Amino acid sequence: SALGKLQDVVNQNAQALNTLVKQLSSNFGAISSVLNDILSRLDPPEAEVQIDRLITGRLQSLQTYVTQQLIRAAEIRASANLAATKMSECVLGQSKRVDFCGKGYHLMSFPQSAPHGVVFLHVTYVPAQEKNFTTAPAICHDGKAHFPREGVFVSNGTHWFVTQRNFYEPQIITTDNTFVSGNCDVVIGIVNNTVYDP
Amino acid sequence: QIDRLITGRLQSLQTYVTQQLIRAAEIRASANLAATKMSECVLGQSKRVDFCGKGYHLMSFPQSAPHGVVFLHVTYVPAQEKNFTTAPAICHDGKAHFPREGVFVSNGTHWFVTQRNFYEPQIITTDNTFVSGNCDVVIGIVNNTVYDP
Amino acid sequence: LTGTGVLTESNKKFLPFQQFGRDIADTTDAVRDPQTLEILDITPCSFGGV
Amino acid sequence: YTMSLGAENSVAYSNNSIAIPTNFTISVTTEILPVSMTKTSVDCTMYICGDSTECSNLLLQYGSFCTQLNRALTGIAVEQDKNTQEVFAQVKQIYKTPPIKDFGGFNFSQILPDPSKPSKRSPIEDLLFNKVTNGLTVLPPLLTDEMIAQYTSALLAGTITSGWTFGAGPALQIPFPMQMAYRFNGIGVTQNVLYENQKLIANQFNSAIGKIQDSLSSTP
Amino acid sequence: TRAGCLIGAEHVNNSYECDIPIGAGICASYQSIIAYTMSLGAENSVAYSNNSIAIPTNFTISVTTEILPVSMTKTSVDCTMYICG
Ligand SMILES: *[C@@H]1O[C@H](CO)[C@@H](O[C@@H]2O[C@H](CO)[C@@H](O)[C@H](O)[C@H]2NC(C)=O)[C@H](O)[C@H]1NC(C)=O
Ligand SMILES: *[C@@H]1O[C@H](CO)[C@@H](O[C@@H]2O[C@H](CO)[C@@H](O)[C@H](O)[C@H]2NC(C)=O)[C@H](O)[C@H]1NC(C)=O
Ligand SMILES: *[C@@H]1O[C@H](CO)[C@@H](O[C@@H]2O[C@H](CO)[C@@H](O)[C@H](O)[C@H]2NC(C)=O)[C@H](O)[C@H]1NC(C)=O
Ligand SMILES: *[C@@H]1O[C@H](CO)[C@@H](O[C@@H]2O[C@H](CO)[C@@H](O)[C@H](O)[C@H]2NC(C)=O)[C@H](O)[C@H]1NC(C)=O
Ligand SMILES: *[C@@H]1O[C@H](CO)[C@@H](O[C@@H]2O[C@H](CO)[C@@H](O)[C@H](O)[C@H]2NC(C)=O)[C@H](O)[C@H]1NC(C)=O
Ligand SMILES: *[C@@H]1O[C@H](CO)[C@@H](O[C@@H]2O[C@H](CO)[C@@H](O)[C@H](O)[C@H]2NC(C)=O)[C@H](O)[C@H]1NC(C)=O
Ligand SMILES: *[C@@H]1O[C@H](CO)[C@@H](O[C@@H]2O[C@H](CO)[C@@H](O)[C@H](O)[C@H]2NC(C)=O)[C@H](O)[C@H]1NC(C)=O
Ligand SMILES: *[C@@H]1O[C@H](CO)[C@@H](O[C@@H]2O[C@H](CO)[C@@H](O)[C@H](O)[C@H]2NC(C)=O)[C@H](O)[C@H]1NC(C)=O
Numbered sequence: 001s002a003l004g005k006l007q008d009v010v011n012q013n014a015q016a017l018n019t020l021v022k023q024l025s026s027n028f029g030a031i032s033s034v035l036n037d038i039l040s041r042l043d044p045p046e047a048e049v050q051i052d053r054l055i056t057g058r059l060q061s062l063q064t065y066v067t068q069q070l071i072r073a074a075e076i077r078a079s080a081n082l083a084a085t086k087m088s089e090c091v092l093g094q095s096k097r098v099d100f101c102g103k104g105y106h107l108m109s110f111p112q113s114a115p116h117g118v119v120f121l122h123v124t125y126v127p128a129q130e131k132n133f134t135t136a137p138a139i140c141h142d143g144k145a146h147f148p149r150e151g152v153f154v155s156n157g158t159h160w161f162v163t164q165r166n167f168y169e170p171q172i173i174t175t176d177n178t179f180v181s182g183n184c185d186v187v188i189g190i191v192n193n194t195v196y197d198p
Numbered sequence: 199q200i201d202r203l204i205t206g207r208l209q210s211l212q213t214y215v216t217q218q219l220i221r222a223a224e225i226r227a228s229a230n231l232a233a234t235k236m237s238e239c240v241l242g243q244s245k246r247v248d249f250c251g252k253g254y255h256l257m258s259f260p261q262s263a264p265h266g267v268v269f270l271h272v273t274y275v276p277a278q279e280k281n282f283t284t285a286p287a288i289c290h291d292g293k294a295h296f297p298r299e300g301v302f303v304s305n306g307t308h309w310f311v312t313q314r315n316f317y318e319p320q321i322i323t324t325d326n327t328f329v330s331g332n333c334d335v336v337i338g339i340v341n342n343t344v345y346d347p
Numbered sequence: 348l349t350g351t352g353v354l355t356e357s358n359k360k361f362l363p364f365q366q367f368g369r370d371i372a373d374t375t376d377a378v379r380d381p382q383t384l385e386i387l388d389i390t391p392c393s394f395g396g397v
Numbered sequence: 398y399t400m401s402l403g404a405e406n407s408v409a410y411s412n413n414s415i416a417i418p419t420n421f422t423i424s425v426t427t428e429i430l431p432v433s434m435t436k437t438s439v440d441c442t443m444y445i446c447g448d449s450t451e452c453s454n455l456l457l458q459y460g461s462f463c464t465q466l467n468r469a470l471t472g473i474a475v476e477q478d479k480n481t482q483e484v485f486a487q488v489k490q491i492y493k494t495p496p497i498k499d500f501g502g503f504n505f506s507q508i509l510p511d512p513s514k515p516s517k518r519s520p521i522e523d524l525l526f527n528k529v530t531n532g533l534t535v536l537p538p539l540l541t542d543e544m545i546a547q548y549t550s551a552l553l554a555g556t557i558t559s560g561w562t563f564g565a566g567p568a569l570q571i572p573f574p575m576q577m578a579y580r581f582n583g584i585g586v587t588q589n590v591l592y593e594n595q596k597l598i599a600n601q602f603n604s605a606i607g608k609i610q611d612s613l614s615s616t617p
Numbered sequence: 618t619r620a621g622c623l624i625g626a627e628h629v630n631n632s633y634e635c636d637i638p639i640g641a642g643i644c645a646s647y648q649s650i651i652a653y654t655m656s657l658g659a660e661n662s663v664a665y666s667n668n669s670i671a672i673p674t675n676f677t678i679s680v681t682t683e684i685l686p687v688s689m690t691k692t693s694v695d696c697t698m699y700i701c702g
């Protein structure tokens with residue numbers, strides 16, 4: 001049942017054709033569902049009435065079939081527009097849109113042809129093996145507040161480090177990876193730690 | 199007479215089913231849009247303009263509604279703007295300095311560098327600027343000192 | 348006035364000139380018995396999808 | 398009258414002047430999107446004919462029209478459940494908020510579920526539910542209102558306690574004034590601006606959430 | 618059930634994922650046929666505190682499939698031949 005979306009479309013189209021073919025077997029109140037039988041059995045004044053009943057029934061069936069075909073065509077067109085958007089944004093580039101190109105942080109995508117369809121293999125980055133750390137918004141040093149340029153302050157229990165947000169890579173808190181804004185009196189939750197100077 | 203009633207009622211039922219299918223397509227489009235907003239505004243921060251509210255999008259909160267969803271879009275709107283005199287680059291020692299992340303502003307007498315979306319003037323140093331070329335190429339370069347830490 | 352339904356007791360107080368009762372959708376849901384002047388609710392039989 | 402598009406605003410453009418914001422407003426706006434409809438099923442034979450056997454015998458001359466109508470309505474009915482499933486069931490972990498609502502001054506009481514209410518809905522969700530008012534059958538939705546409220550509660554708990562991490566993998570806890578700082582960095586504003594003005598931003602957020610509830614309660 | 622009367626399914630107090638949808642939160646599955654109130658997800662409580670963060674130390678490269686229909690079978694019906702031959 002992996003490929004149920006394409007098979008659903010194939011089954012719906014085949015079932016619509018089968019119903020349209022099956023509707024020819026109905027007489028719609030006429031004496032027969034076969035036109036040749038009516039034309040060989042009756043004079044044109046009453047054969048006209050029987051043929052008229054068959055014509056209005058078959059015309060209603062064909063109009064109904066065309067109506068659901070147009071609705072399904074609109075649905076398939078919307079799906080194809082979505083598939084073209086996924087091909088442009090997931091395959092031909094890297095997308096920042098969450099869950100547009102797979103579950104997780106999207107890296108890249110691969111297109112594969114399928115009968116009446118496309119299959120996108122979304123290659124994504126999933127974080128794993130997370131670990132607790134004690135964190136602070138800023139580091140107080142020399143009466144100045146230090147904030148990370150790109151990372152986050154973490155503590156393993158005794159020592160403070162700065163790491164990138166999506167992967168644990170502890171580095172010494174220096175002036176190269178922090179910036180100074182204001183004193184320590186304003187930021188709520190600032191902790192005291194040394195800031196190394198290269 | 200029963201045949202006349204049958205064809206009239208059948209036409210009414212076909213009309214109802216057809217308009218229900220059209221409305222179902224419209225509701226499906228709206229629900230696909232709602233699922234996109236759920237994925238991109240609630241489960242993440244979106245850079246798409248006006249997709250998750252008016253303003254710079256911060257976050258969104260979903261709320262259930264009868265046959266629907268209500269998104270509370272929390273956005274950042276800049277306010278209390280102030281005029282400043284600006285320049286593309288700073289000429290110092292025959293070198294052109296460009297802001298690394300911000301913009302050069304002047305309050306009338308002194309030149310500072312600030313972030314683009316909030317006024318936070320800082321001294322123009324070599325830590326927040328980068329050097330590319332001389333002062334002869336950039337149109338509108340102004341003369342100001344660049345501090346060295 | 349013919350039909351099929353479950354005839355139960357009704358709390359709807361008809362005015363003396365009224366005989367049948369209709370809902371919003373113009374379906375007969377209340378009626379007065381001609382022999383004894385009492386009001387009966389007509390609940391449709393329990394049709395369902397199997 | 399002839400309508401007016403908007404007030405004229407001649408922007409003071411020059412080749413060497415810029416406008417820099419010195420302050421900010423935390424604005425909360427509502428977006429209402431329909432998701433599903435009422436699932437309706439029609440007995441075609443009973444609608445056209447009721448209990449008349451002669452009518453059904455004449456209706457058999459028209460063929461499988463009734464089957465097509467029933468199948469189209471069944472497709473719409475399963476489509477509504479699929480729509481609700483796609484919109485609300487985007488998480489497979491049911492997250493809960495901590496019992497202590499210490500989020501650095503940020504108040505989420507109007508959007509978190511109310512324990513006092515039997516429906517376990519938020520005050521905003523409760524207001525939203527209060528403000529919305531022959532062969533025919535109405536099928537119930539597959540997800541009840543309690544489970545949809547539970548899904549929204551899980552999404553709110555995930556986005557409050559874990560940021561955007563729960564949408565991309567395991568839910569990684571982060572303090573809410575740090576999550577807000579990350580969001581500030583996402584829109585190009587430095588973290589210090591958020592940390593220095595954290596009380597004002599929390600007050601603005603709470604005021605905006607209250608204005609949202611008042612605006613929904615005061616607009617028909 | 619709120620959907621209607623279900624005959625032939627043993628109602629259980631356990632909650633599983635929805636296999637066959639019944640409606641009004643009721644789903645059916647085969648394990649005999651049982652009917653139950655479907656679970657939404659496994660319950661996870663995030664260990665929130667005002668000064669603790671969780672940092673990933675590893676990663677998984679995950680490839681997922683997304684199937685999207687593009688086109689249908691192109692069918693043409695001769696209206697005159699279909700109605701009249
Ligand atoms: C936190 O991390 C730091 C650095 O990785 C640890 O400090 C080192 O600990 C080892 C083992 O005790 C010593 O051999 C090193 O000399 C330490 N380095 C320094 C610079 O002091 C620290 O022990 C860790 N703390 C905890 C609780 O795990
Ligand atoms: C962090 O460091 C600052 C300064 O080094 C500490 O502030 C001092 O606190 C003592 C006792 O509370 C006062 O007598 C000083 O006047 C304070 N100095 C300043 C400049 O504020 C602060 O207490 C330290 N915090 C922690 C948690 O150790
Ligand atoms: C532009 O800003 C600078 C710095 O904010 C101002 O310079 C200071 O002005 C005050 C008030 O006159 C003095 O007390 C300081 O000594 C000045 N600092 C320095 C480093 O000179 C400057 O006045 C502002 N200019 C205008 C026109 O507002
Ligand atoms: C900015 O500084 C440069 C160099 O300090 C100025 O260029 C000098 O301009 C004077 C008169 O215009 C000439 O006599 C010098 O020969 C120029 N020196 C160089 C190296 O080009 C420039 O005019 C200054 N611009 C402003 C607006 O003050
Ligand atoms: C920046 O300066 C410009 C020009 O000095 C200001 O634009 C003027 O605003 C007043 C009041 O709205 C108008 O009466 C003038 O007609 C405007 N002039 C032009 C040329 O448009 C502008 O308001 C200033 N910006 C701020 C934030 O004060
Ligand atoms: C930035 O804007 C906020 C409000 O949007 C200002 O906060 C108000 O400040 C005035 C005067 O200090 C008080 O009377 C109000 O009660 C404050 N409102 C709130 C909601 O706190 C703030 O002062 C502004 N800051 C700057 C630098 O302009
Ligand atoms: C969070 O917000 C709620 C509602 O906005 C606050 O509850 C209000 O508390 C005051 C004082 O106790 C009462 O007068 C109001 O009637 C309460 N409103 C409601 C709707 O209950 C609540 O105090 C705020 N803070 C916290 C920490 O929950
Ligand atoms: C971070 O620490 C918290 C609490 O110290 C951990 O949360 C506990 O996890 C255990 C193991 O699953 C549960 O039995 C407890 O019920 C949890 N307590 C709370 C209050 O949530 C959490 O697992 C730690 N995170 C990591 C990645 O180890």
Ligand SMILES: *[C@@H]1O[C@H](CO)[C@@H](O[C@@H]2O[C@H](CO)[C@@H](O)[C@H](O)[C@H]2NC(C)=O)[C@H](O)[C@H]1NC(C)=O
Binds near residue numbers: 129674
């Ligand atoms: C990060 O995860 C990978 C796999 O997800 C780990 O690689 C495995 O390491 C163990 C022990 O070293 C081996 O037995 C497996 O065969 C490895 N699997 C693969 C696919 O290479 C890796 O060790 C983890 N790293 C850390 C630091 O936790």
Ligand SMILES: *[C@@H]1O[C@H](CO)[C@@H](O)[C@H](O)[C@H]1NC(C)=O
Binds near residue numbers: 189499501667
């Ligand atoms: C966190 O909460 C504890 C009490 O639960 C408090 O002592 C501490 O100051 C708080 N820290 C911050 C940054 O709010």
Ligand SMILES: *[C@@H]1O[C@H](CO)[C@@H](O)[C@H](O)[C@H]1NC(C)=O
Binds near residue numbers: 337338412413
């Ligand atoms: C900006 O415009 C003024 C005229 O208002 C002109 O004198 C000046 O040279 C221009 N500067 C640039 C960089 O175009």
